[PDB]
Design a binder for these strands. Structure first.
Ligand SMILES: Nc1ncnc2c1ncn2[C@@H]1O[C@@H]2COP(=O)(O)O[C@H]3[C@@H](O)[C@H](n4cnc5c(N)ncnc54)O[C@@H]3COP(=O)(O)O[C@H]2[C@H]1O
Ligand SMILES: [Mg+2]
Length: 90
RNA sequence: GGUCACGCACAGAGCAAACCAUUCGAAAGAGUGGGACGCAAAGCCUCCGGCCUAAACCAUUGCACUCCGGUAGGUAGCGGGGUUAUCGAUG
């Protein structure tokens, strides 16, 4: 089940691309190094993000401590990405 | 002269990117001034593609990695197309 990348939905959709990333970056650094934060505001990708960590444990630490963490008036829903991000698959 | 098409010229004339001041806008970006990178339509119009922005309304609780909802805007100096225009070495 666990993977380097964590899936995050129930995010506020009204947030910009620049802001959203900067805000997630500031939050999840507590758990390890983030290689890149994948945020797009396309129809299917609104209110969700992907955070890719250095080690898998970093994602686990993040996932277990931030579940339902009220971020921008909304408690986050965090789960592991079911498929490895294209950066890791390389 | 009128006209179909075209740009290797020749005669004029014109337009003005960047950057800056300044206003309008949530933004993309536009107006007005100063500026000239360049433009044969860099006059004009969003009808066809694309790109950009997304404040509001609407839809959306969605596993993406090329981007990509409806609608709203922008860009004609991204292309197509429509339209009007200076010169004729040109077909
Ligand atoms: N439709 C036309 N009517 C009359 N003459 C034409 C023409 N198309 C081309 N030419 C002639 O050929 C020259 C080169 O044209 P080009 O388009 O390659 O290169 C041109 C063009 O790209 C640009 N340019 C100049 N004036 C322009 C304008 N009024 N509108 C658009 N672009 C212009 O600067 C270049 C040099 O200008 P320049 O007049 O000295 O030189 C031009 C012009 O004399
Ligand atoms: Mg001349």
């Amino acid at each position: 089940r666990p993977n380097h990348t964590i899936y995050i939905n129930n995010l506020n959709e009204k947030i910009k691309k620049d802001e959203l990333k900067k805000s997630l970056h500031a939050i999840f650094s507590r758990f390890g190094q983030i290689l890149d934060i994948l945020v797009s505001r396309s129809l299917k990708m609104r209110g969700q993000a992907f955070v890719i960590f250095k080690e898998v444990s970093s994602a686990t630490n993040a996932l277990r401590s931030m579940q339902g963490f009220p971020f921008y008036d909304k408690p986050m829903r965090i789960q592991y990405a079911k498929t490895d991000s294209d950066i890791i698959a390389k």
